[PDB]
Amino acid sequence: DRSKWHIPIPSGKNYFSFGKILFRNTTIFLKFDGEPCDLSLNITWYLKSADCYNEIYNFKAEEVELYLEKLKEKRGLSGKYQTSSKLFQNCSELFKTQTFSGDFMHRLPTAMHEPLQTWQDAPYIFIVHIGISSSNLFTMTVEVKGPYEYLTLEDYPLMIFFMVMCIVYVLFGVLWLAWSACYWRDLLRIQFWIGAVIFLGMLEKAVFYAEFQNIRYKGESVQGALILAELLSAVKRSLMRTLVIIVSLGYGIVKPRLGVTLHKVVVAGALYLLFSGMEGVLRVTGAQTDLASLAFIPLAFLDTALCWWIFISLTQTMKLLKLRRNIVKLSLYRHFTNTLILAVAASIVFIIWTTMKFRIVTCQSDWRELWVDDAIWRLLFSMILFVIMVLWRPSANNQRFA
Ligand SMILES: CCCCCCCCCCC(=O)O[C@H](COC(=O)CCCCC)COP(=O)(O)OCCN
Ligand SMILES: *[C@@H]1O[C@H](CO)[C@@H](O)[C@H](O)[C@H]1NC(C)=O
Ligand SMILES: *[C@@H]1O[C@H](CO)[C@@H](O)[C@H](O)[C@H]1NC(C)=O
């Protein structure tokens, strides 16, 4: 999420905690700036490694004060940790105690590791507590910097994946543009909708990559980038679904362009955008009003209805084409049906695997590939889009589908 924090000290209970997966040899910097001191301060910090990812997931800030005691009485989850505490009589707002010239303090469940560093890439929990000895007085700035300026783990693979996807979509666009240019005398609206889909995918990937670059080099995410990416993704998915429905219905390929076919039937099927969008932005906001739990039910219902309709229509159209004795289009429709079947099977298998790999054990022992749940869908969509592109490639005899 973030790699730089600003915290005015006199707030709440003064605790500051964060849990996240971190690289190895990552340093944590604390800086204190503000008005002249009046009172003495006592700063205590804990940095704990986590063996398995459950602890980070179910870490509640409001109970941190209690959590610590469970850690101290030797009853918490397994994992080594470092603890330290220092006392300043008026203010050490200029000293560099946490910067350099430190000592080697032993770790607890010797070691003699660096004062404030990560000794192994894993899920870490950092807690800092400021006690003032007897309205703002200070403003603590906290940063984490590792081998990469601000890009923690769990984000590096995602950034690389988005870069690769951007390159792939650029290649898709270049190839489609070349084919279209070669044969411009005749074309079909489907070959324009495909290009629009490619363009939207390119824009989504570019936005995501730029946002990740900014987060890496500045430590803060851009406020209005996730929303834009989600909206673009929803638009692209809705357009692809509508295109598939139109192709299956045979509108303009096997039957005359009847008006009723679109009106009240297909275009209304664009409400799938709303729901698809509705959850999207909410997922960015964190599901604060917890409707995210009751958000995917309408989406699943709509997807089931659309699949049922698509398969019924495909069977009807293929039967009609076989009866008509046409041969050229029959092979194309057969390949289209096979591709759809394979996509459905892959989606089912992926859902089963994710469910059986995440909600199956007390706590995940393999958090490294925890990002795959947010990347398989995009790869599958890219594969489907490439197959469709190859099927409907403009050619010299691009008139068999009048
Ligand atoms: C309260 C305790 C129980 C709760 C389980 C909550 C798990 C969170 C993930 C939800 C999920 O399981 O994901 C959804 C898939 O449907 C399902 O629900 C799975 C089968 C069940 C059918 C209702 C949404 O994903 P989608 O929009 O279909 O993916 C397409 C996107 N292109
Ligand atoms: C800071 O608070 C701790 C409480 O854990 C207590 O030992 C003392 O007041 C301070 N610690 C020092 C001065 O080492
Ligand atoms: C703490 O000691 C004095 C006493 O008030 C204070 O003025 C100063 O800023 C702090 N540091 C030192 C070295 O005196």
Residue numbers in the entry: 38 to 146, 168 to 192, 203 to 470
Paper text:
In this study, we identify and characterize the unique cation channel TMEM87A as a Golgi pH-regulating cation channel (GolpHCat), determine its atomic-level structure, delineate its ion conduction pathway, and ascertain its functions in Golgi homeostasis, protein glycosylation, and biological processes, and investigate its contribution to hippocampal spatial memory by employing multidisciplinary cutting-edge technologies, including Golgi-specific pH imaging, proteoliposome-single-channel recordings, cryo-EM structural analysis, molecular dynamic modeling, proteomics/glycomics approaches, and animal behavior tests. Taken together, these structural analyses suggest that TMEM87A is a monomeric ion channel with a putative ion conduction pathway that can be opened by voltage stimulation and closed by PE.
Although we investigated the ion conduction of TMEM87A, we could not identify an ion conduction pathway beyond the constriction site due to the presence of the R2-fatty acid chain of PE occupying the hydrophobic TMD cavity. Based on this, we hypothesized that the lower hydrophobic cavity of TMEM87A might be a potential pathway for ion conduction and that our structure represents a non-conducting state in which the lipid chain obstructs ion conduction. To verify this, we determined the cryo-EM structure of a hTMEM87A mutant A308M, which we predict would block the ion conduction pathway at the entrance of the lower hydrophobic cavity. Indeed, A308M effectively sealed the lower hydrophobic cavity, resulting in reduced channel activity compared to that of the WT. Interestingly, the PE density in hTMEM87A A308M was displaced to a position similar to that of the S6 state in MD simulation.
